[PDB]
């Protein structure tokens, strides 16, 4: 029942000093070796310090660790932060026969330009109609901020059933892009005269319309 306690969120401006703690629950922190792994997002973890004072060959000198056995806490001190330090630090105590990893500590330090919501629409294809389905796809792209509200319309009545939308995502254009899908039956697509997608972004509204042709 030995668990390591680590703060969830730690943020500090670059160039300053910060202390990362790791508190043991039952066993004393000086009983067993405490190791810190620096893991980049979408990458394998890498050892950043071991033996509570020993640095691996390759990491810089700033990664310093200390042990406070009176408070049952392991302290990792970082001095002079910069960009690539934005990784996850897990304090590891294998103890005996079981690695107890820490919760983890991330980093948070801080140009997206404003843009117009280009909107395109497509009607359901004939192949989809032959496969007893119909889906209207609304696409919002090349815009900023990434906070848009979609509202499907059947001629004049809003449609909310079967509406699926995507959260805005980052692209190479430094702008945002999103998507919206309206699943429909083949008879519902041809029941209304026209279907339109309305996109609201920074007050301005861009609306496209399609018709069964």
């Amino acid at each position: 029942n030995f668990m390591l306690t680590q703060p969830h969120s730690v943020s500090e401006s670059p160039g300053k000093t910060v202390t990362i703690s790791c508190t043991g629950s039952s066993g004393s922190i000086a009983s067993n070796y405490v190791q810190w792994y620096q893991q980049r997002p979408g990458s394998a973890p890498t050892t950043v310090i071991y033996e509570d004072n020993q640095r691996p060959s390759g990491v810089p000198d700033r990664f310093s660790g200390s042990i406070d056995s009176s408070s049952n806490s392991a302290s990792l001190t970082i001095s002079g932060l910069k960009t690539e330090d934005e990784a996850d630090y897990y304090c590891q105590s294998y103890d005996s026969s079981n690695v107890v990893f820490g919760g983890g500590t991330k980093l948070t330090v801080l140009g997206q330009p404003k843009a117009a919501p280009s909107v395109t629409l497509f009607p359901p294809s004939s192949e989809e109609l032959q496969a007893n389905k119909a889906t209207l796809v609304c696409l919002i792209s090349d815009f900023y901020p990434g906070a848009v509200t979609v509202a499907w319309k059947a001629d004049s009545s809003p449609v909310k059933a079967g509406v699926e939308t995507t959260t805005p995502s980052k692209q190479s254009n430094n702008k945002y892009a999103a998507s919206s899908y309206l699943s429909l039956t083949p008879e519902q697509w041809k029941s209304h005269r026209s279907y339109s997608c309305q996109v609201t972004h920074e007050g301005s509204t861009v609306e496209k319309t399609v018709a069964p042709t």
Partner: protein, 49 residues
């Protein structure tokens, strides 16, 4: 959670040679009459009907 804006206020009390100005009230039970009882109406410990 450790860096969010928190609205913190402190309520302090003062003790001087002045009567109470802002203080809590007191509850109210029943009332009796025409019997020899003791009453404390803020100025006297009077016993009587």
């Amino acid at each position: 959670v450790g860096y969010q804006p928190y609205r913190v206020v402190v309520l302090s009390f003062e003790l001087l040679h002045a009567p109470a100005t802002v203080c809590g009230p007191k509850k109210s039970t029943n009332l009796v009459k025409n019997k020899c009882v003791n009453f404390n109406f803020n100025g006297l410990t009077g016993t009587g009907v």
